[PDB]
Design a protein around this ligand. Structure first.
Ligand SMILES: Cc1cn([C@H]2C[C@H](O)[C@@H](COP(=O)(O)OP(=O)(O)O)O2)c(=O)[nH]c1=O
Ligand SMILES: *[C@@H]1O[C@H](CO)[C@@H](O)[C@H](O)[C@H]1O
Lengths: 391, 7
């Protein structure tokens, strides 16, 4: 069995795919990948063959003026790019697993269709499952897409043999997209019954922390973590500042992450430490708690890490949009959710004080063991079944 | 307006 894994999005959209591919070849299967140039180092790092496709997702890795790949402006160029590079890679494959940017998702499904190999699209959060969308929301998306790239797709489609297609939202996401997320954190809801949930796809990180970090994590008190992953909004920097301040008001050390926003410490202070690529799994098991963005991957890792959390709501929790993970952590009682984009120092100091309180420093250590550690395996077996049946 | 992300 050989599987192709496609994707185009933030790192939270990619790490899960890299985990699946790592797990597949670990089980004997073979896995190739198609991702933006951003993840070449990471892939080579994990030992998973990968083909660089399209533009870079992170601004700091592109020309000052080349818009992001998700930018409508350049969508046609996208559809075109994939249909061009995927071939060499999808050839010899038995199944395709993809996620992220719909344009490319569709382009990929197409090529899997020409080969006759099964295709699967996965979402990382329940609220993205079309079953959680309003029958209205559906058509809107469909139209939008059908409008934005509906042609460039069919062109290349007709260019290899297959006929046209419409409602690309339903096409690229499929009638039953997968939910690669853990049950405790991201539970399903009636609207989504026969929906496959495998648990999150996590790659057991074995990378050791640098000698420096190890030193710091020895030259003092057990620190709090501050990071915002792929977050690159300008507020990100302000948020980090306030967080650093709040944690310092608590009288605790800090371990900050540069992330995609390229943050930096503000003092030569010995109570802080900035890190680039680090083994979060490893680090989370060596900090007091973690302050971070409303994201899938980080929230779960800190949950299986067993440490409390402070999640920054992207905006005010309104009737038309709520911070899923942030709220989820609150509802589970493993952390505090603070409103943003730039939370007050008071809110964070309070949130921090609540979090490191027995009640939470316990619900967290306990919930940590209810987390599924076999998501990648479940997806792999589900893949094995697909290939055997429909092919 | 019809394609995804996240960025
Ligand atoms: C910043 C960082 C992240 N990660 C990985 C672990 C997470 O599961 C993964 C994706 O994070 P996630 O929070 O899911 O998404 P986003 O890109 O929106 O922030 O990134 C590392 O392994 N090392 C790092 O230094
Ligand atoms: C696509 O993502 C948007 C962005 O936050 C969400 O509001 C939609 O419901 C989802 O389909």
């Amino acid at each position: 069995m050989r599987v192709l894994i496609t994707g185009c999005g933030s790192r939270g959209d990619t790490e899960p795919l890299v985990a699946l591919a790592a797990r597949l070849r670990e089980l004997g299967a073979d896995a190739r990948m198609c991702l933006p140039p951003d993840y070449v180092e990471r892939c080579a790092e994990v030992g998973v063959p990968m083909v660089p496709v399209g533009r870079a997702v992170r601004a700091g890795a592109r020309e000052p003026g080349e818009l992001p790949p998700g930018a409508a402006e350049v969508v046609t160029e996208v559809v075109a790019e994939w249909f061009d590079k995927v071939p060499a890679a999808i050839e010899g494959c038995d199944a395709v697993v993809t996620t992220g940017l719909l344009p490319a998702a569709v382009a990929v499904r197409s090529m899997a269709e020409k080969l006759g190999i099964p295709y699967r699209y996965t979402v990382l959060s329940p609220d993205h499952l079309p079953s959680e969308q309003s029958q209205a929301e559906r058509d809107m998306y469909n139209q939008g897409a059908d409008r934005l790239f509906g042609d460039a797709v069919n062109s290349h489609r007709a260019s290899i043999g297959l006929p046209p297609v419409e409602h690309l939202y339903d096409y690229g996401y499929t009638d039953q997209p997968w939910l690669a997320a853990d049950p405790v954190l991201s539970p399903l809801r009636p609207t989504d019954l026969g929906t496959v949930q495998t648990g999150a796809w996590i790659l057991p990180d074995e990378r050791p922390l640098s000698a420096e970090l190890e030193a710091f994590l020895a030259a003092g008190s057990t620190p709090v973590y501050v990071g915002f992953g792929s977050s690159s909004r300008p507020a990100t920097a302000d948020a980090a500042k306030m967080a650093i301040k709040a944690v310092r008001a608590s009288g605790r050390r800090i371990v900050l992450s540069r992330g995609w926003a390229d943050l930096v410490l503000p003092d030569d202070g010995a109570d802080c430490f900035v890190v680039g690529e680090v083994n979060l799994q490893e680090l989370f098991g060596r900090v007091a708690a973690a302050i971070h963005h409303d994201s899938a991957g980080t929230t779960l890792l800190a949950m299986r890490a067993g440490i409390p959390q402070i999640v920054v709501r992207r905006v005010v929790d309104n009737v038309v949009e709520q911070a899923y993970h942030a709220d989820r952590v609150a509802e589970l009682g493993v952390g505090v959710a603070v409103d943003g984009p730039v939370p007050t120092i008071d809110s964070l100091s309070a949130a921090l004080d609540t979090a490191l309180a027995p009640e939470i420093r316990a619900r967290a250590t306990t919930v940590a063991d209810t987390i599924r550690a076999d998501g990648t395996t479940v997806a792999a077996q589900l893949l094995f079944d697909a290939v055997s049946l429909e092919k | 307006x019809x394609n995804x992300x996240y960025x």
